[PDB]
Amino acid sequence: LVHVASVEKGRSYEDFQKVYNAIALKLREDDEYDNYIGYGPVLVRLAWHISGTWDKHDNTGGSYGGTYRFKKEFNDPSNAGLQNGFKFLEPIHKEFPWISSGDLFSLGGVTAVQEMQGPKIPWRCGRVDTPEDTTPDNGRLPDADKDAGYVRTFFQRLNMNDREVVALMGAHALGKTHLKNSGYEGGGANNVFTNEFYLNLLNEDWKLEKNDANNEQWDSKSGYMMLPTDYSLIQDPKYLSIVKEYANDQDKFFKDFSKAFEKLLENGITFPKDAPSPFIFKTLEEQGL
Numbered sequence: 001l002v003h004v005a006s007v008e009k010g011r012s013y014e015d016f017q018k019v020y021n022a023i024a025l026k027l028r029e030d031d032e033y034d035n036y037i038g039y040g041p042v043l044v045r046l047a048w049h050i051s052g053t054w055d056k057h058d059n060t061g062g063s064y065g066g067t068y069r070f071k072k073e074f075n076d077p078s079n080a081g082l083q084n085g086f087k088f089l090e091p092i093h094k095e096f097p098w099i100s101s102g103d104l105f106s107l108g109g110v111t112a113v114q115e116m117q118g119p120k121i122p123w124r125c126g127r128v129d130t131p132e133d134t135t136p137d138n139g140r141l142p143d144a145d146k147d148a149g150y151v152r153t154f155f156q157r158l159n160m161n162d163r164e165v166v167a168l169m170g171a172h173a174l175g176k177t178h179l180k181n182s183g184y185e186g187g188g189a190n191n192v193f194t195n196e197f198y199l200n201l202l203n204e205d206w207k208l209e210k211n212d213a214n215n216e217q218w219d220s221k222s223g224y225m226m227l228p229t230d231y232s233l234i235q236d237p238k239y240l241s242i243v244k245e246y247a248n249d250q251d252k253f254f255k256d257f258s259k260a261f262e263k264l265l266e267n268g269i270t271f272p273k274d275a276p277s278p279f280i281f282k283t284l285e286e287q288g289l
């Protein structure tokens, strides 16, 4: 099964920078969502969940086909709460109806990371909407109540190694958990991209508590929280080394995150030899907008 990228007809860098700007202006304007966190964190989670269905063994799932627009994937229990990200993007898609669904959902994640002062993430266009029958079944996204061995094994399906996994998990410095979405509650409610996930893991005094949904989570008196799969990164000696590396080197973390997140968003896609080079979008701030 091969998914060949095909550039939206006649479109070039300038077209996609217009779409980036539309998403970025809306992130700035619609600022009250989720108690003033804004939509940045949910758009990052959305880009990850539409990509995280990929299976390296048969090349099914992944961001290419934009299949989250179909009921089976939209209603996956693992995707509860992402409807808010979908509603945010819908008017953008109406304004630019030429962009494919996979391109829009993945570009939403790139725009959110950059506008939250994260690293630049190169991004390639040419995902093509595929039919409803290509939608992966539910149950490909990970559980949170597991240990390090589970996390490592899970991510082998997406062709990610230990450094890639620990870099990708740094996105958990953003946003919060919501009891009604996932059975977990709390978090720092942060909307600026930093390496604070690693600093908090190493520096806070974590307590294992049970929440109102009867699930265990790790809580600190500062108001931070970690899922069991987050805490597993300091229980496994290989993950722990890399957590310490990113707690001590913000630039290294930004560089490794950028590469792992681009790879996540591109898994399963074949880019022709004559495809355009990846784009690097300017932020609103760099444009003076």
Ligand code: HEM
Pocket: 041, 042, 044, 045, 048, 080, 081, 142, 143, 144, 151, 168, 169, 171, 172, 174, 175, 176, 177, 178, 179, 181, 182, 183, 184, 227, 229
């Ligand atoms: C073992 C892997 C992972 C598990 C089990 C996990 C699980 C979760 C859960 C349960 C939530 C809370 C959802 C809610 O209640 O609203 C969440 C939030 C989030 N996750 Fe993950 N996740 C994982 C990996 C990742 C990765 C790789 C990224 C992105 C690179 C990501 C980005 C996010 C973001 C940004 C949020 C906050 C969303 C918001 O504030 O609305 N996660 N995750």
